Swiss-Prot record:
Keyword Transcription regulation carried by entry: yes
UniProt-listed GO biological process terms: regulation of DNA-templated transcription
InterPro entries: FaeA (IPR006793), WH-like_DNA-bd_sf (IPR036388), WH_DNA-bd_sf (IPR036390)
Keywords, in A-Z order: Activator, Fimbrium biogenesis, Transcription, Transcription regulation
Domain of life: Bacteria
Organism of provenance: Escherichia coli
One Pfam family matching this protein: FaeA
Protein name (record): P fimbrial regulatory protein KS71A
Keyword Transmembrane helix (UniProt): no
Length: 81
């Protein structure tokens, strides 16, 4: 169930793959394979954990981190207007 993995990362944030599996206690093997498939869509992200042994996977940071209101109110509505 990928929904449990994404919803889980929402409440928390930052956990190795086998660690994320422990949180859901689901199929750690299938859990990790999910973060990868989802990461390809851009709904989740992962970190090259260079200090441990299981990388890291967590929701795509959060939201409003790119389309914040579409940033369509920072160029003056038509100069002079």
């Amino acid at each position: 169930m990928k929904n449990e993995i994404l919803e889980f990362l929402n409440r928390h944030n930052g956990g190795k793959t086998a660690e994320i599996a422990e949180a859901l206690a689901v199929t750690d093997y299938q859990a990790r394979y999910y973060l990868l498939l989802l990461e390809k869509a851009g709904m989740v992200q992962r970190s090259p954990l260079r200090r441990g042994m299981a990388t890291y996977w967590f929701l795509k940071g959060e939201k409003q981190a790119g389309q914040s209101c579409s940033s369509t109110t920072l160029e003056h509505h038509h100069h002079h207007h």
